[PDB]
Design an enzyme around this catalytic site. Structure first.
Site, PDB file in Angstrom:
ATOM      1  N   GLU A 198     -51.472  45.384  75.397  1.00 30.35           N
ATOM      2  CA  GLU A 198     -51.533  44.276  74.320  1.00 30.35           C
ATOM      3  C   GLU A 198     -50.250  43.976  74.015  1.00 30.35           C
ATOM      4  O   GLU A 198     -49.690  42.743  73.870  1.00 30.35           O
ATOM      5  CB  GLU A 198     -52.348  44.864  73.228  1.00 30.35           C
ATOM      6  CG  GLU A 198     -52.413  43.758  72.200  1.00 30.35           C
ATOM      7  CD  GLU A 198     -52.990  42.420  72.534  1.00 30.35           C
ATOM      8  OE1 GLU A 198     -53.792  42.339  73.166  1.00 30.35           O
ATOM      9  OE2 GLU A 198     -52.792  41.541  71.824  1.00 30.35           O
ATOM     10  N   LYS A 238     -48.255  41.892  76.750  1.00 30.34           N
ATOM     11  CA  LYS A 238     -48.748  40.509  76.762  1.00 30.34           C
ATOM     12  C   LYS A 238     -48.145  39.646  75.630  1.00 30.34           C
ATOM     13  O   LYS A 238     -47.533  38.565  76.225  1.00 30.34           O
ATOM     14  CB  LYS A 238     -50.391  40.729  76.743  1.00 30.34           C
ATOM     15  CG  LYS A 238     -50.838  39.436  76.107  1.00 30.34           C
ATOM     16  CD  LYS A 238     -52.458  39.342  75.929  1.00 30.34           C
ATOM     17  CE  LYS A 238     -52.897  38.150  75.515  1.00 30.34           C
ATOM     18  NZ  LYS A 238     -52.428  36.944  76.476  1.00 30.34           N
ATOM     19  N   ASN A 239     -47.898  40.076  74.717  1.00 31.66           N
ATOM     20  CA  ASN A 239     -47.330  39.167  73.402  1.00 31.66           C
ATOM     21  C   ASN A 239     -45.818  39.370  73.772  1.00 31.66           C
ATOM     22  O   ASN A 239     -45.333  38.101  73.516  1.00 31.66           O
ATOM     23  CB  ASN A 239     -47.657  40.160  72.171  1.00 31.66           C
ATOM     24  CG  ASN A 239     -48.957  39.799  71.697  1.00 31.66           C
ATOM     25  OD1 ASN A 239     -49.444  38.741  71.357  1.00 31.66           O
ATOM     26  ND2 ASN A 239     -49.799  40.909  71.728  1.00 31.66           N
TER      27      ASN A 239
HETATM   28  N1  LIG Z   1     -43.490  23.800  72.296  1.00 31.55           N
HETATM   29  C1  LIG Z   1     -43.210  24.919  72.920  1.00 31.55           C
HETATM   30  O1  LIG Z   1     -44.130  25.778  73.051  1.00 31.55           O
HETATM   31  C2  LIG Z   1     -41.831  25.215  73.350  1.00 31.55           C
HETATM   32  C3  LIG Z   1     -40.692  25.348  72.191  1.00 31.55           C
HETATM   33  N2  LIG Z   1     -39.398  24.841  72.375  1.00 31.55           N
HETATM   34  C4  LIG Z   1     -40.497  26.916  71.795  1.00 31.55           C
HETATM   35  O2  LIG Z   1     -39.404  27.439  72.401  1.00 31.55           O
HETATM   36  N3  LIG Z   1     -41.224  27.789  71.273  1.00 31.55           N
HETATM   37  C5  LIG Z   1     -42.774  27.348  70.856  1.00 31.55           C
HETATM   38  C6  LIG Z   1     -43.765  28.190  71.324  1.00 31.55           C
HETATM   39  C7  LIG Z   1     -43.352  30.026  71.221  1.00 31.55           C
HETATM   40  N4  LIG Z   1     -44.703  30.640  71.781  1.00 31.55           N
HETATM   41  C8  LIG Z   1     -44.819  32.028  71.286  1.00 31.55           C
HETATM   42  C9  LIG Z   1     -45.722  33.009  71.965  1.00 31.55           C
HETATM   43  C10 LIG Z   1     -46.337  34.030  71.603  1.00 31.55           C
HETATM   44  C11 LIG Z   1     -45.300  34.742  70.789  1.00 31.55           C
HETATM   45  C12 LIG Z   1     -45.321  36.307  70.318  1.00 31.55           C
HETATM   46  N5  LIG Z   1     -44.165  36.244  69.153  1.00 31.55           N
HETATM   47  S1  LIG Z   1     -44.163  37.491  67.855  1.00 31.55           S
HETATM   48  O3  LIG Z   1     -45.162  37.190  67.034  1.00 31.55           O
HETATM   49  O4  LIG Z   1     -42.623  37.730  67.781  1.00 31.55           O
HETATM   50  C13 LIG Z   1     -44.602  38.943  68.579  1.00 31.55           C
HETATM   51  C14 LIG Z   1     -45.736  39.418  68.162  1.00 31.55           C
HETATM   52  C15 LIG Z   1     -46.391  40.736  68.945  1.00 31.55           C
HETATM   53  C16 LIG Z   1     -45.554  41.440  69.722  1.00 31.55           C
HETATM   54  O5  LIG Z   1     -46.043  42.352  70.129  1.00 31.55           O
HETATM   55  C17 LIG Z   1     -44.409  40.848  70.192  1.00 31.55           C
HETATM   56  C18 LIG Z   1     -44.046  39.781  69.647  1.00 31.55           C
HETATM   57  O6  LIG Z   1     -42.643  39.261  70.252  1.00 31.55           O
HETATM   58  C19 LIG Z   1     -43.537  34.959  69.101  1.00 31.55           C
HETATM   59  C20 LIG Z   1     -44.176  34.062  70.140  1.00 31.55           C
HETATM   60  C21 LIG Z   1     -44.110  32.757  70.522  1.00 31.55           C
HETATM   61  C22 LIG Z   1     -42.043  30.156  71.489  1.00 31.55           C
HETATM   62  C23 LIG Z   1     -40.937  29.188  71.134  1.00 31.55           C
END
Ligand SMILES: NC(=O)C[C@H](N)C(=O)N1CCC(Nc2ccc3cn(S(=O)(=O)c4ccc(O)cc4O)cc3c2)CC1
Ligand SMILES: NC(=O)C[C@H](N)C(=O)N1CCC(Nc2ccc3cn(S(=O)(=O)c4ccc(O)cc4O)cc3c2)CC1
EC number: 2.7.11.2
Lengths: 337, 337
Positions: free
Chosen positions: A229, A232-233
């Site tokens: 898990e 994956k995050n």
């Molecule tokens: N429009 C877009 O989607 C592109 C945009 N320019 C962009 O850069 N983005 C926006 C989307 C975003 N996506 C995600 C996806 C999943 C994500 C998980 N973390 S966390 O919350 O810090 C986090 C949580 C638990 C863990 O165990 C480890 C972790 O790290 C940030 C995320 C960010 C990343 C930043």
């Protein structure tokens, strides 16, 4: 033993407290089949009944929903299934093979408890709203309910796996190998969906024995669930935050063995999250295909007196830390009563 | 205004709620002297009275101790000192210079509140014991009492510093410079006592503006207090855990600026601490010469809606993170009521 008596049975077994076992106690049960059978035909009814009793203290607007009624009906039937063995003879290896069969039946019956209860939460949000007092009551109940369920599955797993490594317990679990397994699996999925994946760097800090690989007594499938898990995050964060970028920073894992704690930190540069939004990641209501989810992963850590914490630096990335007990004498079931 | 009436005065001003100000509100007050005077001669009595009222809800076994009586007597006299201005003329610059004099007198009168209340806690531990319910009641009361005090000192500092940077506020506080200042001071002390000191490495992550130095609107003396206390712990951990070793690993600080958070992480390799012992580091009772201490440092972070958290890897080291609001519109006093 029949449905008509079930309230009486629940009331009786609910007067007992569950008996939290330690890792050692688990190793001794699985070094004994009659002893395990004799223990479990009392302990399982006690654990089933203590959680059924707490379910009955939920408000009627929760109790009357189909999902909770369905789950309740499963627990009643499982209690009944075990009560048929209360007057049977341990000396009789047909009793024992039947018991093991009834345990596999119970475990499979309960396979869908999490998505069933999750449907109930989704409904609650739409029928009564997702306010902070609701979130706190739901969090309280489901942490206890799900931890209870993990402990029942642990008992069943130990019996059916041993009386066909010590069941689901590895007395010499190599932590870095489980880290690599969960990473390799997450990478397969990440490669499929995103075309690329971050690398993995592992570092071990064995404070008292600088050279020696880090091992522990643990349930490696539980450790895998948590790490998978988390990977994956961390991978999703890393890939999606570097789309306009060329290089993917690696995911770095440190495994530290101290006198009391065995700590596993996973650090990513996925861009992180503001402090205000960390708590909701563990909320059943605010989180409402692969992996058990963050709330349940934390319960697996808590089950043997560990923990799972997230801390982020918005704009940079996130550290996830699994805290486990290093010593199997401190590794004791955490059980709701 | 006299002692004999004080209970009546307290009761009156305690019916009002304190008015939490934002950073902007603070900048506007100090861009106005009559306006600050008119605001403070009502707000200071309200803040003094709200905390005096909560002090009176402490058990008699706490209320009757010399330390609490002494502190109470200081607050009463300070309320009296300000009430003499309630019927005075703002247009009259002798009023205003007198007010500023009375504020410097109040601030200096209260200079010893923390060691005085700390003596009360030491006594409580020996006269009634350091049990977990006592710890929680003490933690609750002192967090609120000390945060109240920080906010009163902030108001006084703003008035007396401006009507003799915007008082104690730097509209363009360069975070890395304050980090370096606190490090340089801690290193002086560390060099003295231990003969050597770790180096400092600073890294900035300005997510939205990769090149640009990280600045913010903040109270740099508050930031210094927090960072100095953190450096002191990280240096002591680093030096004392590497006595049989030759090299001292550096202390690494990351400053990240995100959309909402400005986060400051200090990472050491001081050997860390088991999870079970982290909480007590913030306990007034379980912590019972240089620096304000971890409990109070966390309150400085919380005062403008930030936080201060510790997470360690036993056997390796500890990360300390200051979370501040990046935007001065989110930087609002957190005030007990
Ligand atoms: N429009 C877009 O989607 C592109 C945009 N320019 C962009 O850069 N983005 C926006 C989307 C975003 N996506 C995600 C996806 C999943 C994500 C998980 N973390 S966390 O919350 O810090 C986090 C949580 C638990 C863990 O165990 C480890 C972790 O790290 C940030 C995320 C960010 C990343 C930043
Ligand atoms: N007998 C001895 O003293 C020598 C012995 N062999 C040894 O190595 N030891 C024992 C003494 C011990 N000393 C200290 C002193 C101070 C210490 C502070 N941290 S912390 O709790 O992780 C910590 C806390 C807040 C913070 O902001 C940063 C932090 O890091 C560990 C310390 C450890 C270090 C390890």
């Amino acid at each position: 033993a029949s449905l008509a008596g079930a309230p009486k049975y629940i009331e009786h077994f609910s007067k007992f407290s569950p008996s939290p076992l330690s890792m050692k106690q688990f190793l001794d049960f699985g070094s004994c089949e009659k002893t395990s059978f004799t223990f479990l035909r009392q302990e399982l009814p006690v654990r089933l009944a203590n959680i059924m009793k707490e379910i009955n203290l939920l408000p009627d607007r929760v109790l009357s929903t189909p999902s909770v009624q369905l789950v309740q009906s499963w627990y009643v039937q499982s209690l009944l299934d075990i009560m048929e063995f209360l007057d049977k003879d341990p000396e009789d290896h047909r009793t024992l093979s039947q018991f093991t069969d009834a345990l596999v039946t119970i475990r499979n019956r309960h396979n869908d408890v999490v998505p069933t209860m999750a449907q109930g939460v989704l409904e609650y949000k739409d029928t009564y709203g997702d306010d902070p007092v609701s979130n706190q009551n739901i969090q309280y109940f489901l942490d206890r309910f799900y931890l209870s369920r993990i402990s029942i599955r642990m008992l069943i797993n130990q019996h059916t796996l041993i009386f066909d490594h010590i069941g689901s317990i590895d007395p010499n679990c190599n932590v870095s190998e489980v880290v690599k397994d969960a990473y390799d699996m997450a990478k397969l999925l990440c490669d499929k969906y995103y075309m690329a994946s971050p690398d993995l760097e592992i570092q071990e800090i064995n404070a008292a024995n600088s050279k020696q690989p880090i091992h522990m007594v643990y349930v490696p499938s539980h450790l895998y669930h948590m790490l998978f898990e988390l990977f994956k995050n961390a991978m999703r964060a890393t890939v999606e935050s570097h789309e306009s970028s060329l290089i993917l920073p690696p995911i770095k894992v440190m495994v530290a063995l101290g006198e009391e704690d065995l700590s596993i930190k996973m650090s990513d540069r996925g861009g992180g999250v503001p402090l205000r939004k960390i708590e909701r990641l563990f909320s059943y209501m605010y989180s409402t295909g692969f992996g058990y989810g963050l709330p349940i992963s934390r319960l697996y850590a808590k089950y043997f007196q560990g923990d799972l914490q997230l801390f982020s630096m918005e704009g940079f990335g996130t550290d996830a830390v699994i805290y486990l007990k290093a010593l199997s004498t401190d590794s004791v079931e955490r059980l709701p009563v």
